[PDB]
Write a protein that binds this ligand. Structure first.
Ligand SMILES: [Mg+2]
Ligand SMILES: [Mg+2]
Ligand SMILES: [Mg+2]
Ligand SMILES: [Mg+2]
Ligand SMILES: [Mg+2]
Ligand SMILES: [Mg+2]
Ligand SMILES: [Mg+2]
Ligand SMILES: [Mg+2]
Ligand SMILES: [Mg+2]
Ligand SMILES: [Mg+2]
Ligand SMILES: [Mg+2]
Ligand SMILES: [Mg+2]
Ligand SMILES: [Mg+2]
Ligand SMILES: [Mg+2]
Ligand SMILES: [Mg+2]
Ligand SMILES: [Mg+2]
Ligand SMILES: [Mg+2]
Ligand SMILES: [Mg+2]
Ligand SMILES: [Mg+2]
Ligand SMILES: [Mg+2]
Ligand SMILES: [Mg+2]
Ligand SMILES: [Mg+2]
Ligand SMILES: [Mg+2]
Ligand SMILES: [Mg+2]
Ligand SMILES: [Mg+2]
Ligand SMILES: [Mg+2]
Ligand SMILES: [Mg+2]
Ligand SMILES: [Mg+2]
Ligand SMILES: [Mg+2]
Ligand SMILES: [Mg+2]
Lengths: 99, 97, 116, 117, 305, 62, 287
RNA sequence: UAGGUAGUAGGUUUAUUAAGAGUUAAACCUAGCCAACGAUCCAUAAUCGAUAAUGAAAGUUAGAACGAUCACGUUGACUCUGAAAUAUAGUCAAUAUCUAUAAGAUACAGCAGUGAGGAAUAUUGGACAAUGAUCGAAAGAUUGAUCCAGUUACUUAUUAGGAUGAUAUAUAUAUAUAUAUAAAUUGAUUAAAAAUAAAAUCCAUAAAUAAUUAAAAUAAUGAUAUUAAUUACCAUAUAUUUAUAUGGAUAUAUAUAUAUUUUAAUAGUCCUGACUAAUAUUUGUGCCAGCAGUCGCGGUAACACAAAGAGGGCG
């Protein structure tokens, strides 16, 4: 079932921008067709030639949009500036020595 | 021979060197014995037999010992019954298998 | 999920062909290690229907042999079920709508019933 | 595989089935009677003989068997709410329902166990 | 003492003597040719007894011991022939008394070397139909039918099953002409089951033999003390043989899950006692052993159990 | 170890890499080993037609 | 499975499960299996050779050993002749789908039956099977596609040229006969290369109206008006443990073959001593 | 390894502990305790099963894999927090590498992987889709647990083609068709075979090529994945999987008459004197070359060495 485009994100491109995680640079693989994006599934996306992680994310955000849950770029997890829990002790010491 | 296929009891007989041991067998269980014993059984009409030779396994003495055991070590049930003055039934036969 | 005692699925069987073993286990002990009590089994691959059967309109079944009374007892003493296990229990009819999360939350075709 | 014939040709093991009531109940009268009967002496005796002493620090007898009053146990583990009608909000209602369900199940389980034994 | 023994016929045949260098023929091949007789332009070995199919309800099984390897009969008259000094065939000088005087049992004995293997009889279609009617319309029990006719109860059930299938095929118009002809030929080949002939009737008191009976026991009862079948059964710790024969002749909480419009499958929850339900821990992996268990699916797919 | 070398002819120096297996040369006393012949500096026995795997011999390949 | 190679040679008089002409001859000229002037081991070997050639030549030895059951089966009549217990050594193979199909005579051979079921023609209780190691339970139907059954039991469908050549000779014979009748319809094969309808139009004998000798329905996989196989009689041994109906080509597997006081239901071309020797061998794996 | 033992054996008390106890610490007594049915001492070894192997069984063997228990996370000691730690933590020392040179950091027995050792044991893979685990109110974040694929015949299993098949021409409502010319491989000249083996012939099926649609998972999410499976030009519409009728797909003759993708087959390796299954024979070598589990074989007639032929196992 197709949903309506909202005021905040009325376009496919706008939706892509909203969701993020480098979902931009994906306006060529499918053109700005609202119905097209929503009806399309995983296999179709794979055939077109998108990534696995990107494919997973888009579908999830589509689903959220359908259910009217707030879509936004929940960024992927990042290691600490110093290091991963294991490497910190040494890295931190090195950083201190440098500075 | 019991039921025209095996020996009556589990016999244990010594002929010179060879120590024989011949167990009776349920029907269908074949001849499972020393090759000389098997040969003798085939000729003597024993279908079912288990057994094992200890001490000497001198082929000739096996052949002599096993026929001696058959003739001598065996007692038919009827003979035993007559000696003791008792009935000596075979339960399987009575049942009808 | 939370807890020390937890009702969850331990994996069994071979590659590309899982069967599950519904257990109650310690949270710390491993996924396929020996648990406190095995309550039941669960094969996720549904029983395959015939073409004629499909045409008629008969749904596949997922078999879930399960000690009901034991499971109930374990729930009572406060052994939290996993996301899949709790769903299974709800489907059976042990647990209420209370356990259903916001994601789960559609007209019903066939209603539940006990049979023999 | 050889030793599985002891256990009915069952390869692999289950964990031991865990007793729901972990002591004998008060309703199990025969057990209580057995416990309380005069303990024997002589060759097949249990305790200490009347005349003979026992080590200074140690107890003479064995400790007494705590018989479960099942109703009491139920009351303690699974108390019904005193504030009966205080209930607003959806999450709170859900929690209350869950509690009720847990009460039901544990009550049933214990009572069944008592009857079953 | 065993050699490698080339399997020449036990019976006598015209061996090779000398022959033209190029032909390269073997004695076995020669013997085979002789057995066959001469081959047609079509391909048929007509003179061989065993080429054509019998239309007699009398199976034409092999008697190499009786005819002494001489298989060749004249097709029209079924009269025996031999290979003479010339290449032409002709009748034998001495007649065979072995082929003339043959028993009932040996006519239904496909292989000469195994007396025990015999052919089972074929049921006439009319008889099968009558059996089917009895079981369905008249509503008689299968045991009574078996007693009447002389078939075994599983055999009767099988027949019934086949009759209904045949009827369904006839309704659909699947039973082709070629199939019918084949069926007729097969019927003609085999001997017919007679319900009156006592020797042809199947023995209906055959129980299967258990383990406890086979292991022989003996009892020294008093000379006068009686000891019947029941007593023997009691000793062995079984039910009596008659009772077992009679037996041969003659719950659990299940929930189903709710089915919402979208979801594609139900959840059937059967009850099961704890300590008896699960997949056991530390069981024997049998996959790399040659005693590995291979089952089959509902769709006939081969599946590792 | 005193190792036997089978085959009609052989290729073994005073330093060659050689693999030893646990056979026994029965006529020679005090030698309870065989050099396995396909592997190492010990080469496969030449123009071997029968029993080729028992020596090093590869399949001639027409 | 073990590859088919020299199964029907004459220098080894091995009697295979088939209706082949060479197999028939082997069966004919074997007589017994000679166990005289042999050691016990040699006798056991010769039994193994003969008995396994018939019973599961496609099976590998190790595989066979694994499947081989010691505990044989039998039935007490409780109402005389001696039951042949040890004919049951290869009773376990009749439980197989492939063997059952062969017994039913829905295949010429065991190999052929195996091929048929691989190709997905057999059914057992509706569901199609592609697995010869499938084992029937008592009560299971099994059903081969009728065309394949006909092919198995029918004659070999001739090539067109061969059929035409056969027709030509028949025509000549007919012409000779009519000449002889007078005293007291030709075809040129070189011209008529591969025009089947033309050939049909040309031909008109009393015993075949148009169709060439071997091709009345070329689209069908067997001989013309269906006739039986060239040596079908000596192998048509109707089994006890199957109930068969040749119209539909269905067959109920009603029993696991079992030995009575009179006979065994394991159809074999070997005497009981041979089967005993085989059993002896396979108990110990030839120890 | 024949004597061992001096907190040793036992009693009385105090501390420490949640709590017993020469367990530690302290104090005072008694003279014990263990041992040739093996003490003390040394050496070796992680232990075990409803696991695996083998046996008729009692047993014996393994302890890879599945699971349960222990101990360790380069070595040794101690401390802190804690219900529980001599913690893969911290402290100090020991060994060996890093820079950043500092009351530094690291220690792959986490996963990949490298060098070494060795007869010998894999990818510096993909995904969090499933099942778990940690954090978070949730949104969802992490996850070399895990699930998947990769390499490796290490193991097991299923397939890895069936039926017919001994010649080639030429001539002339029946039917044993019959003559004639030609040819015919390695052996061998008859019980010496190789050989129904080939080649042909009939019939499929895999793979391919197209179309379709699961299931592992549902609220949605599928790494595996050119997924398994099914159909053979697709769909609907009747009956009981088969059969027929429609709708459209298609192409030549002159909208409707016959058709409907394609299509195979390929095994080693050991052995043939007896134990031990292998009789069709022949050549070379000449106590040499070589064989050999065992007895043995080779000195011109070698069934044993090296080969051809034929044969027997397992595959
Ligand atoms: Mg939480
Ligand atoms: Mg021999
Ligand atoms: Mg050799
Ligand atoms: Mg070779
Ligand atoms: Mg103290
Ligand atoms: Mg101490
Ligand atoms: Mg002190
Ligand atoms: Mg000692
Ligand atoms: Mg160690
Ligand atoms: Mg260790
Ligand atoms: Mg042990
Ligand atoms: Mg282990
Ligand atoms: Mg050990
Ligand atoms: Mg390991
Ligand atoms: Mg540690
Ligand atoms: Mg340490
Ligand atoms: Mg590593
Ligand atoms: Mg390390
Ligand atoms: Mg190395
Ligand atoms: Mg996950
Ligand atoms: Mg990863
Ligand atoms: Mg390995
Ligand atoms: Mg294999
Ligand atoms: Mg020649
Ligand atoms: Mg295919
Ligand atoms: Mg000697
Ligand atoms: Mg020579
Ligand atoms: Mg040899
Ligand atoms: Mg040799
Ligand atoms: Mg050769």
């Amino acid at each position: 079932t197709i949903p309506k485009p909202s005021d905040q994100v009325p376009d496919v491109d706008a939706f892509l921008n909203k969701i993020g995680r480098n979902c931009n640079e994906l306006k060529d693989t499918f053109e700005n067709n609202w119905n097209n994006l929503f009806q399309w599934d995983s296999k179709i996306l794979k055939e077109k030639g998108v990534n696995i992680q990107q494919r997973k994310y888009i579908l999830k955000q589509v689903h959220n949009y359908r259910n009217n849950r707030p879509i936004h770029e929940i960024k992927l997890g990042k290691k600490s500036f110093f290091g991963g829990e294991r490497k910190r002790k040494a890295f931190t010491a090195k950083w201190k020595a440098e500075n | 021979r019991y039921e025209n296929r095996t020996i009556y009891g589990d016999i244990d007989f010594r002929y010179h060197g060879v120590k024989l041991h011949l167990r009776s067998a349920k029907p269908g269980f074949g001849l499972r014995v020393n090759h000389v014993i098997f040969e003798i059984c085939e000729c003597a009409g024993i279908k079912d037999l288990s057994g094992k030779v200890y001490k000497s396994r001198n082929d000739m003495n096996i052949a002599k010992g096993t026929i001696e055991a058959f003739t001598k070590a065996q007692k038919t049930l009827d003979e035993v019954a007559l000696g003791r003055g008792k009935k000596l039934v075979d339960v399987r036969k009575v049942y009808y298998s | 999920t939370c807890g020390l005692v937890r009702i969850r699925l331990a994996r069994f069987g071979r590659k590309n062909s899982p069967v599950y073993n519904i257990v109650v286990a310690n949270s710390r002990k491993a996924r396929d290690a020996k648990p406190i009590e095995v309550l039941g089994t669960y094969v996720p691959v549904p029983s395959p229907v015939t073409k004629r059967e499909l045409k008629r309109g008969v749904v596949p079944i997922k078999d879930v042999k399960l000690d009901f009374d034991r499971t109930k007892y374990w729930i009572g003493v406060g052994a939290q079920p996993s996301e899949t296990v709790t769903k299974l229990l709800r489907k059976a009819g042990i647990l209420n709508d209370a356990w259903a999360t916001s994601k789960n939350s559609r007209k019903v075709v066939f209603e539940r019933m006990e049979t023999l | 595989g050889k030793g599985a014939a002891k256990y009915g040709f069952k390869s692999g093991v289950f964990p031991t089935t865990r007793s729901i009531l972990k002591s004998p109940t008060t309703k199990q009268t025969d057990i209580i009677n057995k416990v309380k009967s005069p303990k024997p002496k002589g060759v097949l005796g249990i305790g200490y003989a009347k005349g003979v002493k026992h080590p200074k620090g140690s107890h003479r007898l064995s400790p007494k068997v705590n018989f479960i009053d099942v109703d009491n146990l139920i009351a303690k583990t699974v108390a019904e709410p005193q504030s009966i009608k205080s209930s607003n909000g959806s999450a709170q209602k859900v929690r209350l329902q869950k509690a009720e369900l847990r009460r039901k199940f544990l009550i049933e389980a214990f009572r069944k166990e008592e009857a079953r034994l | 003492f065993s050699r490698r023994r080339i399997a020449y016929p036990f019976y006598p045949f015209k061996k090779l003597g000398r022959q033209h260098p190029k032909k390269h023929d073997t004695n076995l091949k020669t013997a085979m040719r002789q057995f066959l007789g001469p081959k047609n332009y079509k391909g048929e070995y007509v003179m061989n007894k065993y080429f054509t199919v019998p239309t007699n309800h009398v199976p034409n099984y092999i008697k190499p011991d009786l005819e002494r390897g001489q298989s060749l009969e004249h097709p029209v008259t079924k009269k025996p022939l031999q290979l003479r000094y010339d290449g032409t065939l002709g009748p034998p000088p001495v007649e065979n008394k072995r082929l003339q005087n043959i028993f009932k049992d040996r006519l239904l004995q496909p292989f000469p070397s195994n007396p025990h293997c015999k052919t089972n009889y074929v049921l006439s279609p009319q008889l099968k139909q009558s059996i089917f009617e009895e079981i369905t319309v008249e509503g008689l029990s299968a045991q009574q039918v078996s007693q009447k006719y002389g078939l075994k109860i599983p055999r009767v059930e099988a027949i019934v099953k086949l009759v209904s299938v045949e009827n369904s095929w006839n309704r659909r118009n699947r039973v082709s002409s070629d199939l019918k002809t084949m069926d007729e030929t097969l019927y003609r080949m085999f001997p017919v089951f007679d319900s009156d002939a006592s020797f042809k009737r199947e023995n209906l008191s055959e129980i299967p033999v258990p383990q406890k009976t086979l292991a022989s026991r003996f009892l020294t009862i008093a000379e006068s003390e009686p000891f019947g079948p029941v007593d023997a059964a009691h000793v062995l710790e079984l039910e009596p043989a008659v009772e077992t024969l009679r037996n041969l002749s003659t719950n659990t909480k299940v929930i189903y899950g709710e089915l919402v419009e979208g979801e594609r499958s139900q959840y059937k929850f059967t009850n099961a006692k704890v300590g008896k339900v699960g997949y056991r821990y530390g069981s024997g992996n049998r996959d790399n052993k040659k005693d590995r268990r291979i089952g089959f699916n509902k769709l006939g797919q081969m599946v590792y159990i | 170890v005193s190792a036997y070398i089978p085959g009609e002819g052989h290729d073994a120096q005073e330093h060659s890499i050689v693999y030893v297996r646990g056979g026994r040369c029965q006529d020679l006393p005090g030698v309870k080993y065989h050099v396995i012949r396909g592997a190492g500096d010990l080469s496969g026995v030449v123009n071997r037609i029968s029993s080729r795997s028992k020596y090093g011999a590869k399949k001639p390949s027409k | 499975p073990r590859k088919a190679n020299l199964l029907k040679s004459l220098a080894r008089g091995r009697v295979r499960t088939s209706f082949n002409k060479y197999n028939l001859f082997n069966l004919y000229k074997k007589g017994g299996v000679d166990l005289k002037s042999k050691s016990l081991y040699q006798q056991k070997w010769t039994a193994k050779q003969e008995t396994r050639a018939y019973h599961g030549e496609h099976l590998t030895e190790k595989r066979w050993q694994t499947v081989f059951k010691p505990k044989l089966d039998s039935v007490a009549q409780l109402d005389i002749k001696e039951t042949p217990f040890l004919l049951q050594t290869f009773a376990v193979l009749e439980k197989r789908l492939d063997f059952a199909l062969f017994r039913a005579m829905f295949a010429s051979s065991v190999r052929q039956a195996r091929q048929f079921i691989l190709h997905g023609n057999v059914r057992v209780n509706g569901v199609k099977i592609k697995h010869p190691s499938y084992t029937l339970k008592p009560g299971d139907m099994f059903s081969v596609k009728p065309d394949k059954v006909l092919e198995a039991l029918g004659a070999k469908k001739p090539s067109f040229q061969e059929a035409l050549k056969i027709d030509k000779t028949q025509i000549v014979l007919w012409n000779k006969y009519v000449k002889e009748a007078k005293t007291e319809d030709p075809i040129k094969l070189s011209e008529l290369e591969g025009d089947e309808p033309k050939a049909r139009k040309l031909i008109n004998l009393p015993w075949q109206k148009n169709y060439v000798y071997g091709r009345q329905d070329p689209k069908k996989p067997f001989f013309t008006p269906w006739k039986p196989r060239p040596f079908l009689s000596p192998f048509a041994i109707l089994p006890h443990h199957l109930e068969i109906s040749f119209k539909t080509c269905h067959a109920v597997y009603l029993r696991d073959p079992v030995a009575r006081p009179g006979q065994s239901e394991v159809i074999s071309p070997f005497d009981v001593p041979v089967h005993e020797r085989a059993y002896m061998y396979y108990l110990r794996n030839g120890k």
